[PDB]
Amino acid sequence: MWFEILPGIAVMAACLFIPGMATAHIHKFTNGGKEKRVAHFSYQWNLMERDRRISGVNRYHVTKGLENID
Amino acid sequence: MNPIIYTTLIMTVMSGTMLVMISSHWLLIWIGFEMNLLAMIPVLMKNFNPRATEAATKYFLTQATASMMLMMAIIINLLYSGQWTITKMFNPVAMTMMTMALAMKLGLSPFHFWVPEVTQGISLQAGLLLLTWQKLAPLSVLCQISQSINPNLMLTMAMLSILIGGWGGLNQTQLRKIMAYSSIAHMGWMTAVLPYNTTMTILNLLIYITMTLAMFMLLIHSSATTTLSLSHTWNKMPVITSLMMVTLLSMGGLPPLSGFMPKWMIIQEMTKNESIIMPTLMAMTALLNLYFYMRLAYSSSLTMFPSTNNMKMKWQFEHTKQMKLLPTMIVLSTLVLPMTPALSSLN
Amino acid sequence: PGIVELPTLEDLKVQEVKVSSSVLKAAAHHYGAQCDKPNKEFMLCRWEEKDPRRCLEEGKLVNQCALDFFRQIKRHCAEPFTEYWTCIDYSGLQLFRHCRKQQAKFDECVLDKL
Amino acid sequence: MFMINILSLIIPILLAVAFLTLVERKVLGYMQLRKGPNVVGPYGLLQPIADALKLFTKEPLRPATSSISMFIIAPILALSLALTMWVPLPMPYPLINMNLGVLFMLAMSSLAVYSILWSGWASNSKYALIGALRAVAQTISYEVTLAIILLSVLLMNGSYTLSTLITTQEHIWMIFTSWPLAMMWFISTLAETNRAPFDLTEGESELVSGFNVEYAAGPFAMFFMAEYANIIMMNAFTAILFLGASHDPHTPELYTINFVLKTLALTITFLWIRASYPRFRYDQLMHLLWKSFLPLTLALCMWHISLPIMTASIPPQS
Amino acid sequence: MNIMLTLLTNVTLASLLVLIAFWLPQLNAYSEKTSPYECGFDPMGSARLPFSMKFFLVAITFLLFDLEIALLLPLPWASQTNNLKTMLTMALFLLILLAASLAYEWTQKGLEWAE
Amino acid sequence: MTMYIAFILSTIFVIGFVGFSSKPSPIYGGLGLIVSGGVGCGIVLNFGGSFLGLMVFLIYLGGMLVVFGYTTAMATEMYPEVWVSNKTVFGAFVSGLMMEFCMVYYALKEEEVEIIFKFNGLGDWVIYDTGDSGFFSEEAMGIAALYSYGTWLVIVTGWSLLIGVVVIMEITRGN
Amino acid sequence: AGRIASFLKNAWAKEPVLVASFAIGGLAIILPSLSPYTNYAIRINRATPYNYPVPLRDDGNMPDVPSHPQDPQGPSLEWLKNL
Amino acid sequence: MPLVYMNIIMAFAIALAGLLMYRSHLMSSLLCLEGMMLSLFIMSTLIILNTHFTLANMMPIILLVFAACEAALGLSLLVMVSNTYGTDYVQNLNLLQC
Amino acid sequence: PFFDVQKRLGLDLDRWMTIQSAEQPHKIPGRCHAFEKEWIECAHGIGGIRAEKECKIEFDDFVECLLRQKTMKRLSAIKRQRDKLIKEGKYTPPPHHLGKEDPRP
Ligand SMILES: CCCCCCCCCCCCCCCCC[C@@H](O)O[C@H](CO[C@H](O)CCCCCCCCCCCCCCC)COP(=O)(O)OCC[N+](C)(C)C
Ligand SMILES: CCCCCCCCCCCCCCCCC[C@@H](O)O[C@H](CO[C@H](O)CCCCCCCCCCCCCCC)COP(=O)(O)OCC[N+](C)(C)C
Ligand SMILES: CCCCCCCC/C=C\CCCCCCCC(=O)O[C@H](COC(=O)CCCCCCC/C=C/CCCCCCCC)COP(=O)(O)OCCN
Ligand SMILES: CCCCCCCC/C=C\CCCCCCCC(=O)O[C@H](COC(=O)CCCCCCC/C=C/CCCCCCCC)COP(=O)(O)OCCN
């Protein structure tokens, strides 16, 4: 044997691992490494739009902290 | 069919009509129409046979089309003015579609073909319901929007209804089809005066309903659906034939009978406007309805037709079921003209 | 039907608060505690006038109060606040729940200093 | 960058389906005192590749009496829908983040039945037609109760968003709160995927190949892939809905591993159930779903509406 | 936009698989090969003849029971209202009405298939 | 002019309507209605109505499954008709397509009153909202208000559904 | 009281599914009216601030309205933290 | 109005026209009825979304409910007609005349 | 015809959903709340016939808000003139209408 069924299960598990890990890594790579923003409502979308406008590089992920307020 | 289920369906029909009559929201009025139709369809098929099935199918198709156009007119009115209240109907195209949909529901000419067919295909009780109770909701809606109504379309359909009712009734030997064409002509009379005075519409509706109830109850009492089967009633119950003759005379509009009152008041109201030609044509045309009522009276009451041997057995038995409101309906159908000024309480 | 009155572009200029959403969320509770009065004045003007052109000076006062608040935070609690808003910013939903140590340190800093 | 994500989702799913065929064959063999594939490749590891290459190099037949357009459309719809039903699943992050993910799965799954319907009708043969009407009956059997069970379970989530299910079950699995609903949902997913004991549409003993009897080669292969992808997807949905993995925002790999293990266990349970039971009669499935499942589901829906209000345990996010 | 791209990608992959399946292998079609399968003997009638539905009444009931699902789906949001007593009365009213309709059809033999 | 997505979706909606209105066969008509339901879901989605679009798509999928079964049972014949198998069906289909194309050209190049009012186009982005507020979906709150504001609607709807069950049982009784 | 007990036993012996369904439905119908936390759920629903609280103009005659969020006046959520 | 409004109204008119002209099958006309219902749903939803009328978001659900009732009614009548004639042709419903 | 049962008993069966300016959940306003409010207040109690004439201005404003026909007419006129100017080469549109602006929060 019954442990000879295991290689197929391992291959299936490796195949099924790929989507979740790939999605997580691609989300991190395209969002500054910090977990792509969720906007289920218009207020969060407005926050994201405001962030994009003040970044200066037209990207919402770049964040301006206390050094941007002189 | 279970009596409890039948009573529930009748109450659902009446609930839909009352919801139409008491609502202020267009959606609730449309819902009332849907509920009324849904409960009405099985009542037409209570005695199951192919003719009843065909009548129910035709009725369903006509009324579903009418309700679809009704909803579209409501939505167009909402689009051009965000109003759900039943009022002057701020859009003219929506008003035209609304008028056509309500005319389809009532059976006004040009859309009058379904009425003779559905009436002939169902039983006399179903016909009574269809030709009396089913006129209330569309007429109430038409009364509530009478100000925004276009006279040219409504008057055209009313005159066409009177003409077609008379001409179609001239050709019938089946009593249910005669009743249907009579209903078409009376609907035409009701809608002719609607743009001028809704009180006259209500008065005509009430008088017509009374006469129709009396006629249908007399027909149910003497189980006749054809002219020849009604020609036997004199040899079994002559009083029924005499009362039917007087009620038929009343339906014709001859004074001093109660039937004459709505036509008289509508003619007066139309002459209070300018409107001279239209009432003249309407009266001349109602002469045709009088003609075929008179032919029915000739066949059933004023002459005696040959009978059969087996009527002797029927002579020995009495009518089991008794209609408690038939005498009052006959009296109201015939002897009510002197109380005409009481119509003031209708407004 | 008449011309629409509009303020000139010069009348619309003001010192801008240019911090991202995560910084604002991190500082929001203390900002609402400290800058309450000008914000309430501006909101009352906004909801009574029903016209944005009549409450511009109040908006400028709101901006100045926010700038003063953030200048104080910079002057006294720079690093704890930076850690707190970095923590808040990492989250995709920007959740308060996942960073309580940083919030506690920032709260202690502001309570002692100010 | 988004196309890379689409490919990284859809290619591994097809590989998982291909190797699930082998895993099912081996599990059934070992439960039947035999081995299963173990010759072509070490431990039958190359058997799926051989099956696919044999099927795609085999002649495809268009029946003389069949409607050709629908006959070709049906497998395309099946495979594309099976691929699409994966995009809102959070693992722990979804490819497509929807406000109403659950309703999207409901609608797409109820669209998927037309693949079987149209293939069976367009084949223009009697066994295919019988399979198609069995599909109609099966959908009528399971749909209403499936939807009500979903609503009852999600009344504790607070929304229809799939990602909220992770935070809802942060401390306890949802199966400890709604295990009767979990049982009915499991049987409903068995019926929804045309799996034994509810594999009525194929009806192998009764109907030869049933709905897909006319189909051969590559077109036939597409139907098989769609069905097995649906198996895996429905079990992943069940794992997310009832056995909630704990998610660390700085280590999503742990969540992914745990979730994959759970869905693999559920798929192996599907294979076990197939190996263990006989087939229903398709009127008996409708009677089971309408006379036993439906009243209990309505009662439990009433209970799950009432319970959060009585206990002041209403979820957030109106 | 992303969902449209996903739909396009999936449909394109399925279409390409069909295209490869139909253009790669060798085709040898002749009339016997393409004839309808009925276990080795020619079918008597057509498969387009009417096929009776013994569960027709349950199918119509499915149409009505399906619309009550649309009425019950907004319930998660309805639980957030301030007047929880009116909402809970109305949710139970709808579900009791739906159970009564099942009880009526069950007792009138509406769930039994025609023979 | 922005990507014309809504206009394309509405055109495909009209095309599916023409497809099932030509009445080629019930099997084909149901397919056209399914396509129309899908594009209508898309049109409503592009306006913020996610719930309503998904709901109408689900409802029409169930309805068309029942219709497919009923077509197989009661509305079949030896040679079912397609849009190119009959001169009447093909003529109606082509007439509908040409009417739609004529109306589109007429309203797109000119600014004319077809029947009700006029229209110049510009894409339906213009009349949008630029509304910036909320932790909730306004459509969801409105639909959920059925259980607190719409008590009368709930009553009449539930009664009508129960009556519909009774009505279909009475109609199909036969005898 | 004696025939209904036998009816209950027969139903449990023949249709356990229906017995369970009816019991669950009845409990769900009657329990919410007897629970003390229903009003707690109502209060929690009423305490969720979806929209902005527009302040009131001071006319000098509202002692019960706070002049600052941290003032002792106004409603309190202290009951919620103990729940 | 925009182009989408005209397109939806055109779809309604086409479905109405489809219902008005009968071919042979009754089921086709029932499909046209459902199409009119769908068109009305889409039009009302677009109007209500555009004007941000919050309490009107629930009317199209009611419309769908009564559409389902109407479709069930039509299907029952079709079952009866087919049981009578073995076909759902509208040519067979000619027992009653005007 | 119309039996005002609601008015007689004070029930409010459907009046809550008749107009856009009537108590929406969470106080969410309609897009044309002010225009409908003014049209209703102006026409209240004077009857239908008088209202159609003396509240024509408020109703016209409300319909303009609802459908926005004059607004698109004006915008299309402006854009047509701008396109004509650029085609002959006499406008030179500003940098902030071409995407090279300096955005503000
Ligand atoms: C998994 C999905 C993604 C994969 C990505 C790849 C997708 C590949 C695309 C799908 C098709 C795959 C099939 C591959 C086999 C070739 C089939 C066909 O294209 O070849 C021939 C196409 O050729 C045509 O018959 C005529 C020849 C070319 C027509 C001239 C058109 C003008 C083109 C200009 C040519 C000049 C030089 C080209 C270079 C510039 C058809 O021959 P035919 O026998 O019927 O079909 C059976 C093929 N057999 C023999 C293998 C069994
Ligand atoms: C005179 C003859 C009487 C008997 C015949 C009655 C015929 C009609 C059937 C039922 C009568 C309808 C009256 C109820 C109308 C509902 C509205 C009213 O009751 O107020 C509601 C109160 O709701 C209560 O729960 C009463 C409704 C309880 C319904 C019980 C079921 C009765 C239906 C049975 C008959 C219907 C057909 C048969 C199906 C079973 C809402 O109150 P509230 O939420 O504070 O305020 C809303 C405003 N907000 C939003 C600003 C807050
Ligand atoms: C304090 C307040 C709490 C409120 C009450 C809560 C407790 C309620 C307790 C009862 C819950 C029971 C739920 C069970 C639901 C179905 C029960 C049932 O009766 O169904 C069976 C049918 O169920 C089945 O037999 C299933 C058929 C398919 C079997 C396929 C394989 C079996 C599944 C293997 C294990 C599945 C594990 C499920 C969960 C997986 C994880 C999600 C009825 O069929 P018959 O015996 O023929 O009788 C009906 C007519 N008299
Ligand atoms: C009070 C709240 C109510 C709401 C909650 C319930 C939610 C929904 C549940 C009801 C759904 C519909 C009910 C279906 C009715 C079935 C009618 C029927 O015909 O019953 C027979 C079975 O006979 C019965 O009636 C079963 C026994 C009587 C009904 C079941 C129990 C009724 C209530 C008993 C318990 C009451 C409360 C529990 C108290 C527990 C005591 C401590 C069905 O069997 P057949 O299919 O006909 O078999 C044919 C093959 N030979």
Side-chain angles (χ1 to χ4, degrees), chain B residues 136 190 199-213 346:
Chain B
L136 298 177
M190 268 160 218
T199 299
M200 302 294 162
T201 311
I202 295 167
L203 171 76
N204 193 352
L205 170 73
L206 289 183
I207 284 150
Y208 155 85
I209 281 173
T210 298
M211 297 199 280
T212 308
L213 284 172
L346 278 180

Side-chain angles (χ1 to χ4, degrees), chain B residues 223-238:
Chain B
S223 301
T225 48
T226 72
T227 304
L228 279 198
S229 64
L230 185 64
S231 63
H232 286 345
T233 307
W234 78 271
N235 213 33
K236 167 73 195 150
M237 312 143 308

Side-chain angles (χ1 to χ4, degrees), chain H residues 1-2 5 47-60 62, chain I residues 16-20 22-25 28-32 66-67 69 72:
Chain H
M1 295 144 36
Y5 284 2
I47 292 160
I48 288 159
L49 289 180
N50 182 64
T51 57
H52 295 256
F53 196 147
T54 309
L55 277 172
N57 275 110
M58 62 154 96
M59 171 257 320
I62 308 302
Chain I
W16 55 275
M17 200 192 147
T18 45
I19 63 171
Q20 162 192 234
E23 167 98 323
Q24 311 298 306
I28 299 157
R31 184 163 62 76
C32 299
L66 278 163
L67 286 170
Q69 267 144 357
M72 326 195 231

Side-chain angles (χ1 to χ4, degrees), chain E residues 49-106:
Chain E
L49 290 166
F51 194 71
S52 194
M53 209 209 257
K54 300 304 165 181
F55 51 91
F56 73 97
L57 190 55
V58 193
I60 302 184
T61 312
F62 168 78
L63 292 173
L64 299 184
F65 285 16
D66 209 4
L67 254 294
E68 327 213 26
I69 296 330
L71 290 176
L72 293 171
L73 283 187
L75 272 178
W77 295 298
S79 291
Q80 315 275 341
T81 188
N82 284 358
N83 39 321
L84 277 179
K85 261 166 199 93
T86 304
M87 157 266 170
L88 184 57
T89 304
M90 293 306 125
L92 299 169
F93 168 87
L94 219 55
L95 280 164
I96 283 159
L97 262 283
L98 174 56
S101 74
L102 177 72
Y104 178 77
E105 178 166 313
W106 188 336

Side-chain angles (χ1 to χ4, degrees), chain D residues 101-175:
Chain D
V102 174
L103 308 190
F104 178 84
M105 332 267 297
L106 264 188
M108 288 300 117
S109 68
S110 92
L111 175 62
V113 194
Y114 289 90
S115 290
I116 287 97
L117 293 200
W118 289 338
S119 62
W121 188 84
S123 292
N124 202 2
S125 44
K126 293 178 177 72
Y127 286 108
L129 184 73
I130 299 170
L133 294 294
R134 286 188 175 190
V136 174
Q138 187 139 351
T139 294
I140 283 159
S141 302
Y142 72 76
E143 242 290 327
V144 168
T145 165
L146 186 90
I148 305 178
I149 288 159
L150 258 175
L151 160 56
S152 293
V153 173
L154 292 174
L155 275 155
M156 209 93 72
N157 199 52
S159 61
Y160 285 104
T161 302
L162 285 165
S163 312
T164 320
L165 287 162
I166 299 170
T167 80
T168 299
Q169 308 171 73
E170 184 149 314
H171 303 294
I172 201 169
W173 289 347
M174 198 99 92
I175 203 178

